[PDB]
Amino acid sequence: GGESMLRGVYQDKFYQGTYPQNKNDNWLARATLIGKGGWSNFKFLFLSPGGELYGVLNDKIYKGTPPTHDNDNWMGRAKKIGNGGWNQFQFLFFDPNGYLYAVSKDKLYKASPPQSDTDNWIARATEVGSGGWSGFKFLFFHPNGYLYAVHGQQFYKALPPVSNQDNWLARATKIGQGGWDTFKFLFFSSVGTLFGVQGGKFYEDYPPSYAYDNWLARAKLIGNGGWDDFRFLFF
Numbered sequence: 434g435g436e437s438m439l440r441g442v443y444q445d446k447f448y449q450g451t452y453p454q455n456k457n458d459n460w461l462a463r464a465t466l467i468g469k470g471g472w473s474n475f476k477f478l479f480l481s482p483g484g485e486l487y488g489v490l491n492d493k494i495y496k497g498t499p500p501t502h503d504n505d506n507w508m509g510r511a512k513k514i515g516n517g518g519w520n521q522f523q524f525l526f527f528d529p530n531g532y533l534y535a536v537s538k539d540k541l542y543k544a545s546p547p548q549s550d551t552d553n554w555i556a557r558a559t560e561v562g563s564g565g566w567s568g569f570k571f572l573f574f575h576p577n578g579y580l581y582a583v584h585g586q587q588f589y590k591a592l593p594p595v596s597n598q599d600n601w602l603a604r605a606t607k608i609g610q611g612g613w614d615t616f617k618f619l620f621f622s623s624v625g626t627l628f629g630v631q632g633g634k635f636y637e638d639y640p641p642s643y644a645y646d647n648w649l650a651r652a653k654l655i656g657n658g659g660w661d662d663f664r665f666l667f668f
């Protein structure tokens with residue numbers, strides 16, 4: 434059930450709405466304002482597959498159901514689940530089953546998310562990757578459980594590492610040979626459609642399946658202008 438709404442932070446404000454389906458749709462003019470300010474200094478701001486919003490701010494991490502209207506004081510009701518060290522991460526993201534993945538100091542870690550202030554998450558997390566993980570530009574999951582990654586200007590996908598003895602990049606399938614480093618945002622919707630913002634323009638299409646598929650030549654243009662101004666843009 435339910436396709437998730439697109440969300441984004443633009444000029445310190447938080448908006449939500451169904452994603453735009455053509456370049457004549459002025460998304461910002463119709464989107465619901467779900468936060469009046471305070472959103473631009475989060476380092477990370479993302480949603481779990483269970484619908485909980487996670488935010489990293491000033492080295493601490495907070496969670497709560499997302500705000501539904503502009504006067505919902507999200508940070509006043511969010512639960513603080515981390516008191517320090519959350520700005521050390523380069524990436525912080527969920528797999529489809531609710532496990533949190535994190536890249537810190539070139540290593541990849543995985544575990545169920547912290548549920549309280551006193552939980553030393555980084556200490557109990559499993560190290561599933563020992564080196565190479567700060568070299569990616571993007572690292573994100575498809576809803577089918579495959580890990581997608583942009584390395585240099587190349588694009589790859591493969592089931593995630595089973596342990597730190599698993600050399601992921603060596604067995605990954607290459608699904609793109611160039612141009613992937615020029616995107617500002619690159620992410621999946623909840624039904625597996627790939628969405629990307631490249632120089633102000635917003636595109637969507639089924640993801641490439643092999644290195645010679647010219648994704649940008651076939652993708653649908655769903656937005657022209659303003660998308661490079663967002664600080665966060667995600668489903």
Ligand SMILES: CC(=O)N[C@@H]1[C@@H](O)[C@H](O)[C@@H](CO)O[C@@H]1O
Pocket residue numbers: 447467468469470471472503504505506507508509
């Ligand atoms: C980061 C955060 O929770 N910001 C909210 C803001 O969006 C909302 O408009 C306001 C309502 O009083 O409370 C907070 O400031």
Ligand SMILES: CC(=O)N[C@@H]1[C@@H](O)[C@H](O)[C@@H](CO)O[C@@H]1O
Pocket residue numbers: 514515516517518519550551552553554555556
């Ligand atoms: C990144 C990480 O796991 N930081 C945790 C922090 O959230 C927590 O409050 C503390 C409790 O001892 O341990 C850690 O440092």
Ligand SMILES: CC(=O)N[C@@H]1[C@@H](O)[C@H](O)[C@@H](CO)O[C@@H]1O
Pocket residue numbers: 561562563564565566594596597598599600601602603
């Ligand atoms: C990016 C990548 O695939 N890194 C892996 C690393 O996680 C793993 O510990 C090692 C095993 O020899 O191989 C690679 O370096």
Ligand SMILES: CC(=O)N[C@@H]1[C@@H](O)[C@H](O)[C@@H](CO)O[C@@H]1O
Pocket residue numbers: 588608609610611612613644645646647648649650
């Ligand atoms: C961003 C993008 O779509 N890059 C693709 C690239 O992956 C592919 O190898 C090439 C083949 O023609 O076309 C494009 O450039």
Ligand SMILES: CC(=O)N[C@@H]1[C@@H](O)[C@H](O)[C@@H](CO)O[C@@H]1O
Pocket residue numbers: 455456457458459460461462635655656657658659660
């Ligand atoms: C961020 C945003 O909503 N940008 C839209 C843009 O995609 C669209 O092409 C244009 C149509 O007039 O309006 C806006 O600028």
